[PDB]
Design an enzyme around this catalytic site. Structure first.
Site, PDB file in Angstrom:
ATOM      1  N   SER A  19      37.751  -8.113  37.881  1.00 47.92           N
ATOM      2  CA  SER A  19      37.789  -7.040  36.876  1.00 47.92           C
ATOM      3  C   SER A  19      36.509  -6.253  36.990  1.00 47.92           C
ATOM      4  CB  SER A  19      38.122  -7.605  35.506  1.00 47.92           C
ATOM      5  OG  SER A  19      37.960  -6.681  34.429  1.00 47.92           O
ATOM      6  N   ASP A  62      49.138  -6.298  36.746  1.00 49.76           N
ATOM      7  CA  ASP A  62      47.879  -6.310  35.985  1.00 49.76           C
ATOM      8  C   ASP A  62      47.565  -4.846  35.659  1.00 49.76           C
ATOM      9  OD1 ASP A  62      45.284  -6.402  35.161  1.00 49.76           O
ATOM     10  OD2 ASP A  62      44.581  -7.521  36.934  1.00 49.76           O
ATOM     11  N   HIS A  86      46.448 -10.041  34.365  1.00 53.18           N
ATOM     12  CA  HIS A  86      45.057  -9.868  34.738  1.00 53.18           C
ATOM     13  C   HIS A  86      44.291 -11.181  34.700  1.00 53.18           C
ATOM     14  CE1 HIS A  86      41.396  -7.552  35.187  1.00 53.18           C
ATOM     15  NE2 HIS A  86      40.875  -8.140  34.122  1.00 53.18           N
TER      16      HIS A  86
HETATM   17  C1  LIG Z   1      44.083   2.320  27.747  1.00 53.07           C
HETATM   18  C2  LIG Z   1      42.689   1.680  27.641  1.00 53.07           C
HETATM   19  C3  LIG Z   1      41.521   2.652  27.805  1.00 53.07           C
HETATM   20  C4  LIG Z   1      40.684   2.384  29.063  1.00 53.07           C
HETATM   21  C5  LIG Z   1      40.199   3.660  29.759  1.00 53.07           C
HETATM   22  C6  LIG Z   1      39.743   3.488  31.206  1.00 53.07           C
HETATM   23  C7  LIG Z   1      38.439   2.705  31.313  1.00 53.07           C
HETATM   24  C8  LIG Z   1      38.361   1.691  32.462  1.00 53.07           C
HETATM   25  C9  LIG Z   1      38.734   0.311  31.946  1.00 53.07           C
HETATM   26  C10 LIG Z   1      37.934  -0.823  32.619  1.00 53.07           C
HETATM   27  C11 LIG Z   1      38.922  -1.968  32.876  1.00 53.07           C
HETATM   28  C12 LIG Z   1      38.367  -3.321  32.453  1.00 53.07           C
HETATM   29  O1  LIG Z   1      37.892  -4.116  33.247  1.00 53.07           O
HETATM   30  O2  LIG Z   1      38.850  -3.691  31.271  1.00 53.07           O
HETATM   31  C13 LIG Z   1      39.925  -2.941  30.747  1.00 53.07           C
HETATM   32  C14 LIG Z   1      41.089  -3.846  30.370  1.00 53.07           C
HETATM   33  C15 LIG Z   1      42.158  -3.124  29.541  1.00 53.07           C
HETATM   34  O3  LIG Z   1      42.159  -3.699  28.224  1.00 53.07           O
HETATM   35  P1  LIG Z   1      43.202  -2.962  27.279  1.00 53.07           P
HETATM   36  O4  LIG Z   1      44.500  -3.728  27.287  1.00 53.07           O
HETATM   37  O5  LIG Z   1      43.232  -1.407  27.764  1.00 53.07           O
HETATM   38  O6  LIG Z   1      42.540  -2.665  25.892  1.00 53.07           O
HETATM   39  C16 LIG Z   1      43.078  -1.812  24.897  1.00 53.07           C
HETATM   40  C17 LIG Z   1      42.572  -2.426  23.575  1.00 53.07           C
HETATM   41  N1  LIG Z   1      41.935  -1.457  22.693  1.00 53.07           N
HETATM   42  C18 LIG Z   1      42.907  -0.405  22.418  1.00 53.07           C
HETATM   43  C19 LIG Z   1      41.359  -2.106  21.513  1.00 53.07           C
HETATM   44  C20 LIG Z   1      40.870  -0.742  23.405  1.00 53.07           C
HETATM   45  O7  LIG Z   1      40.759  -5.118  29.795  1.00 53.07           O
HETATM   46  C21 LIG Z   1      41.867  -5.879  29.669  1.00 53.07           C
HETATM   47  O8  LIG Z   1      42.938  -5.493  30.092  1.00 53.07           O
HETATM   48  C22 LIG Z   1      41.783  -7.006  28.627  1.00 53.07           C
HETATM   49  C23 LIG Z   1      41.041  -8.194  29.251  1.00 53.07           C
HETATM   50  C24 LIG Z   1      40.989  -9.435  28.366  1.00 53.07           C
HETATM   51  C25 LIG Z   1      39.727 -10.292  28.559  1.00 53.07           C
HETATM   52  C26 LIG Z   1      38.880 -10.304  27.287  1.00 53.07           C
HETATM   53  C27 LIG Z   1      37.739  -9.290  27.160  1.00 53.07           C
HETATM   54  C28 LIG Z   1      36.729  -9.822  26.113  1.00 53.07           C
HETATM   55  C29 LIG Z   1      35.529  -8.902  25.999  1.00 53.07           C
HETATM   56  C30 LIG Z   1      35.761  -7.561  25.281  1.00 53.07           C
HETATM   57  C31 LIG Z   1      36.244  -7.730  23.824  1.00 53.07           C
HETATM   58  C32 LIG Z   1      36.083  -6.462  22.983  1.00 53.07           C
END
Ligand SMILES: CCCCCCCCCCCC(=O)OC[C@H](COP(=O)(O)OCC[N+](C)(C)C)OC(=O)CCCCCCCCCCC
Length: 269
Positions: free
Chosen positions: A146, A201, A258
């Site tokens: 990631s 993922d 993921h």
């Molecule tokens: C649409 C989303 C906007 C993103 C825009 C583009 C930016 C690039 C993204 C970088 C990708 C990356 O490595 O992490 C991005 C991804 C996407 O998470 P998600 O499902 O999008 O979150 C949306 C949730 N909200 C709406 C609250 C933001 O992490 C994952 O999947 C989740 C991984 C789970 C492991 C736990 C993490 C614990 C630490 C953080 C706790 C707060």
């Protein structure tokens, strides 16, 4: 669709990535042994792998991970922890494309990933270089999952070219820059990039391509489900910058996918 040796490597580095999340591996003393709670990294524990440099909360964006010396596999591994803290998370949200001409002409990189790397590049560059100096026959592999895979990918491109190859295995990593970067990473010389994605993922699908992001080629697509174990007939090799057919398909992305790259990854307390 993959050699048993490539499969073996893919698994070995999925555990080194995994291992970076374990808290105790981020402030371990040099010389101690890489271990993981649960069975996050059996193979790594099985090898003779010890900490060369353990770092946590470094530079900007909370850059965390370790530098290990594996005597069993004759390896110098630099593993970056993926996203865990809130700073890690804020840093992922700097998605505006910054200009990284130093790396390559025309190339533009995701801001945060680049800034994080740039903020810790010297220290790490030197830790790697002393390592190589002492074990010049050992192989240098940069890895992560990631955010960690993004970090590994740019650090990889940044440091390739100083007389030691650098192989990069990345798991569930997001796009890291424009097409200029994408083409560059696809062709660079001085080691290989192994971009491993799992079914759908969501992470390898961001940032969207409308923000001007692309993926390097090729992609090793793991096609077996979450929680089922991977065999070498499950890994498929998809070729072509921004190819579809692998992870990059028009369909509902998934979160838990993921977390499953050979085994549970990112969940190591
Ligand atoms: C649409 C989303 C906007 C993103 C825009 C583009 C930016 C690039 C993204 C970088 C990708 C990356 O490595 O992490 C991005 C991804 C996407 O998470 P998600 O499902 O999008 O979150 C949306 C949730 N909200 C709406 C609250 C933001 O992490 C994952 O999947 C989740 C991984 C789970 C492991 C736990 C993490 C614990 C630490 C953080 C706790 C707060």
């Amino acid at each position: 669709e993959v050699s048993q040796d490539l499969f073996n490597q893919f698994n070995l580095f999925a555990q080194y990535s995994a291992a970076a999340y374990c808290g105790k591996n981020n402030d371990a003393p040099a010389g101690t042994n890489i271990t993981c709670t649960g069975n996050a990294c059996p193979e790594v524990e099985k090898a003779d792998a010890t900490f060369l440099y353990s770092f946590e909360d470094s530079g900007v964006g909370d850059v965390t991970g370790f530098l290990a010396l594996d005597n069993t596999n004759k390896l110098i591994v630099l593993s970056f922890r993926g996203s865990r803290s809130i700073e890690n998370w804020i840093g992922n949200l700097n998605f505006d494309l910054k200009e990284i001409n130093d790396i390559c002409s025309g190339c533009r990189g995701h801001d945060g990933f680049t800034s994080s790397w740039r903020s810790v590049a010297d220290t790490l560059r030197q830790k790697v270089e002393d390592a190589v100096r002492e074990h010049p026959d050992y192989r240098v592999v940069f890895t992560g999952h990631s955010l960690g895979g993004a970090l590994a990918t740019v650090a990889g491109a940044d440091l390739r070219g100083n007389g030691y190859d650098i192989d990069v295995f990345s798991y569930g990593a997001p796009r890291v820059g424009n097409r200029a970067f994408a083409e560059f990473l696809t062709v660079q010389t001085g080691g290989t990039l192994y971009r491993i994605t799992h079914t759908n993922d969501i992470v390898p699908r961001l940032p969207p391509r409308e923000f001007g992001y692309s993926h390097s080629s090729p992609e090793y697509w793991i096609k077996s489900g979450t929680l089922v174990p991977v065999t070498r007939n499950d890994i498929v090799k998809i070729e072509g910058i921004d190819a579809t057919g692998g992870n990059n398909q028009p369909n509902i992305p998934d979160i838990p996918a993921h977390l499953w790259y050979f085994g549970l990854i990112g969940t190591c307390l």
